[PDB]
Design a protein around this ligand. Structure first.
Ligand code: ZN
Lengths: 318, 116
DNA sequence: GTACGTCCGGCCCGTAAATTCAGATCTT
RNA sequence: UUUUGGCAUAGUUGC
DNA sequence: AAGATCTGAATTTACGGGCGCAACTATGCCGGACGTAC
C-alpha cells in the first residue's frame, strides 16, 4: 500500500492547495507528465502542512513541482510511519453563544430570537464601544443619551437605536449574526452573566472519612486528586497500607477544633474553628467574629494559613 | 426522512453525483441517501472527500420532485426528496466514473454554472 | 469601488570515544 | 513636597 | 589441529579555551486583514 508524506504548506491555504493539486492532476492526467501520487489530504484542524499519498518520495517531489505554496516542503519530505496512518483521518468532537469575529470575539450573547431561515440569529450583546469619542474597550451598559449627544452615525427610535455600522440596540445590543459565526456548544456561562442577561473539590492534606462500604469510618489524609473516580490514596489512622476510594464514597469530614476554611457559598473567604460536627450541619466560629457559621461538610477544607481579615489614609476632599 | 436533512451548516458538502447536500458527519454515518449502493462512501471518509464537493452554489429544498418543474430543469425528478445543490464544483476520479459506467451509470456532471 | 493605514499572525590538545588484532579458553 | 534607567553587537582609540 | 569468535590495543573527528582594564562614537522588525473614510 502507498504511504503518506508530510509536505509543509502555506498556513491557512491548505484546502486551496488540495483543490489546486486536484485540478493539476485532472489537467495532466492524459499528458506525458502524469502525477503518480494517489491522494492529497488537508485535514480540517491540521494547519500548516498537508499529506501526499505515494509509494516514493521522488513521486511526491515531482508531483508538487510548480506549486509555490509547498515550496518550503519541496527539498525534503517526511514520511508518516506505518502504525499511525489511521490517526490522520481520525476526527473528534434562549440559549447562549459567543461570537467568533469582530470586536465582540468570545463575548457572551443571549440568543434572543432564532430565525428558522438557518442563516442568522438575533443575539443580545453588551456593547464594547467608545461611543465615537476616542476612535477617529471593556463591556459597559449601552448609553443612548451619550451617543445621541456625541452625534455621528446615530438613529434613535426611543429605546431602539441604530448606530456605527448598522449596530442595532434596544434599551443592550440586539443584532443579527451568522450562526456559523457563533458557537452553540460549550459556553456554560456563570451567575454574573445570568445577572447581565455536582462538583468535587478534594485537595492534598485534607482529612476525609468513608461513609459507606466495607471500609467505613476510616479517616485519612488526602494524597492525590483526579477528576471523577479519584481512586484516592488516603493515609488512615493506624494503617501503613494505602487503600482506594472514589469521590462519591468519601466525604470531607473534620475533627472538632481544627483549622477550617470555606471554599464556596455565602461564607467563602472566612477561616475559623468547628465546634461540633453533626450529621451534616458543621458549626464554626470565625477567626474575625464570634458568630455561628453553619456549613455543609463538603464546603470545608483543611488549610492552616492565618486569616487575612488595608487601613490606608485617603483624601475624601481637601 | 429527517435523517437526510442536515443538522447544522458547518462543513456542508454537496455530493458529486446527485448534488445531495449534507454535513460531513451525515456522509460518514449514512453515506449517500440516493446512490450509496453505486458509490459506497459509508464507512470511509476518504471516499466521501473524493465523492463530495466543498464548493457549491444555491440550495434547493425539494419536497415533491414528482410535480416540480425545478426538478425537471435540474434532472433530479427521479431522486428522493431532500436538500440538493444547484451548482457543484468538483469531479469524480476516472476510476469511479469507469466503475459506474461498467454498472450502467454514466456520470453526468452537476456543474451547471455559466463559466464566463 | 479602490486603496491605504494600521492591528494581529508568524590553531591547539587533551580527552575521548569509536575502530581493529592476537591470548584464551572454549568448542570441535 | 528631592529625582534616577535602555540594553548588547560592531568599530575605533589610550596605557 | 583448526577455526573461530572475540576482547584488549593502534588510529580518526569533536568540543573548546583564546590579556587587563578604561574611554569615545555608532546602529537597532514586518505583512495580511479588517475596517473607515472618502
Ligand atoms: Zn454520490
Amino acid at each position: 500500500d502507498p504511504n503518506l508524506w508530510t509536505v509543509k504548506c502555506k498556513i491557512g491555504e491548505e484546502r486551496a492547495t488540495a483543490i489546486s493539486l486536484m485540478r493539476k492532476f485532472i489537467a495532466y492526467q492524459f499528458t506525458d507528465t502524469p502525477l503518480q501520487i494517489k491522494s492529497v489530504v488537508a485535514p480540517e484542524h491540521v494547519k500548516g502542512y498537508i499529506y501526499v499519498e505515494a509509494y516514493k518520495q521522488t513521486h511526491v517531489k515531482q508531483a508538487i513541482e510548480g506549486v509555490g505554496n509547498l515550496r518550503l516542503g519541496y527539498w525534503n519530505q517526511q514520511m508518516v510511519p506505518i502504525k499511525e496512518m489511521t490517526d490522520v483521518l481520525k476526527v473528534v468532537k434562549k440559549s447562549w453563544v459567543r461570537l467568533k469575529r469582530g470586536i465582540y470575539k468570545d463575548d457572551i450573547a443571549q440568543v434572543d430570537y432564532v430565525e428558522p431561515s438557518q442563516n442568522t440569529i438575533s443575539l443580545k450583546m453588551i456593547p464594547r464601544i467608545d461611543y465615537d469619542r476616542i476612535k477617529a474597550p471593556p463591556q459597559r451598559l449601552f448609553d443612548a443619551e451619550k451617543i445621541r449627544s456625541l452625534g455621528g452615525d446615530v438613529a434613535s427610535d426611543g429605546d431602539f437605536l441604530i448606530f456605527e455600522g448598522n449596530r442595532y440596540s434596544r434599551k443592550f445590543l440586539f443584532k443579527s449574526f451568522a450562526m456559523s459565526a457563533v458557537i452553540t456548544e460549550g459556553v456554560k456561562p456563570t451567575l454574573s452573566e445570568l445577572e447581565k442577561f455536582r462538583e468535587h473539590n478534594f485537595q492534598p492534606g485534607d482529612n476525609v472519612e468513608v461513609c459507606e462500604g466495607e471500609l467505613i469510618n476510616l479517616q485519612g489524609k488526602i494524597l492525590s486528586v483526579d477528576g471523577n473516580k479519584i481512586t484516592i490514596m488516603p493515609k488512615h489512622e493506624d494503617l501503613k497500607d494505602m487503600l482506594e476510594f472514589p469521590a462519591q464514597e468519601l466525604r470531607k469530614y473534620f475533627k472538632m477544633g481544627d483549622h477550617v476554611k470555606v471554599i464556596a457559598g455565602r461564607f467563602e473567604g472566612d477561616t475559623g474553628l468547628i465546634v461540633r460536627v453533626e450529621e451534616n450541619f458543621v458549626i464554626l466560629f470565625s477567626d474575625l467574629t464570634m458568630h455561628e457559621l453553619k456549613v455543609l461538610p463538603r464546603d470545608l477544607q483543611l488549610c492552616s494559613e492565618t486569616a487575612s481579615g488595608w487601613g490606608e489614609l485617603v483624601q475624601l476632599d481637601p | 426522512a429527517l435523517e437526510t436533512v442536515p443538522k447544522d451548516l458547518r462543513h456542508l458538502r454537496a455530493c458529486l453525483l446527485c448534488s445531495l447536500v449534507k454535513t460531513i458527519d451525515q456522509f460518514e454515518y449514512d453515506g449517500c441517501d440516493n446512490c450509496d449502493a453505486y458509490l459506497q462512501m459509508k464507512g470511509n471518509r476518504e471516499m466521501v472527500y473524493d465523492c463530495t464537493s466543498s464548493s457549491f452554489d444555491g440550495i434547493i429544498a425539494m419536497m415533491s420532485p414528482e410535480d416540480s418543474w425545478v426538478s425537471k430543469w435540474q434532472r433530479v425528478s427521479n431522486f428522493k426528496p431532500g436538500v440538493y445543490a444547484v451548482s457543484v464544483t468538483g469531479r469524480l476520479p476516472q476510476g469511479i466514473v469507469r466503475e459506474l459506467k461498467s454498472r450502467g451509470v454514466a456520470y453526468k456532471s452537476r456543474d451547471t454554472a455559466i463559466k464566463t
